[PDB]
Amino acid sequence: GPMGNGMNKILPGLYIGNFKDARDAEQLSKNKVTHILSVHDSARPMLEGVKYLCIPQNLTRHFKESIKFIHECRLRGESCLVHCLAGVSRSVTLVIAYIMTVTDFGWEDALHTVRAGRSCANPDVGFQRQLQEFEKHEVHQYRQWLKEEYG
């Protein structure tokens, strides 16, 4: 459906879901989620036991902090949930940017990867164009930055 069927594993330690999934103690416990990257303010208090990164549209300027947050979680064997309102566009864009940086993928191959786990994934055209620009002008330096910081 238009807001998914629950939070979905994309890669080991990386999940995408909607705002409801991000408050679902049963899903969070089952998927051992200890980090949440929120691209939508549910107006509800943060949960205990979880490290948050909250992003208040230009998402490119948030790629670096988002990738660091996800990557440091995954390198320590923990699990991160990225969510927005529907888990279709905003969170998906951030996760595509991450996949592009830890692989040699362009944005379309990264979107294929997200859709393999979360079939409702569908960034809106504005974010597709930001990801196109990212693929052409910046992902190669992000890839080098990741190697210099984390080996």
- Specify whether the CB–CB gap between 121 and 83 falls below 8 A: no
**How many angstroms separate the CA atoms of 41 and 39, rounded?**
7
H/E stretch holding 139: helix 139-150
Pick out the residues of the known binding site for a protein.
Answer: 85-86, 88-90
Pick out the residues of the known binding site.
Answer: 85-86, 88-90
| Catalytic (active site) residue 54 | no
Method: X-ray
* 58 Cβ contact list (under 8 Å, min separation 6): 130
Nearest one of 127, 66, 61, 56 to 99, comparing CA atoms: 66
Q: What is the DSSP string of 98-136?
A: HHHHHSS--HHHHHHHHHHH-TT----HHHHHHHHHHHH
Among the listed residues 54, 73, 80, 84, the single catalytic one is: 84
- Indicate the SS3 state at residue 56: coil
**How many angstroms separate the CA atoms of 73 and 98, rounded?**
13
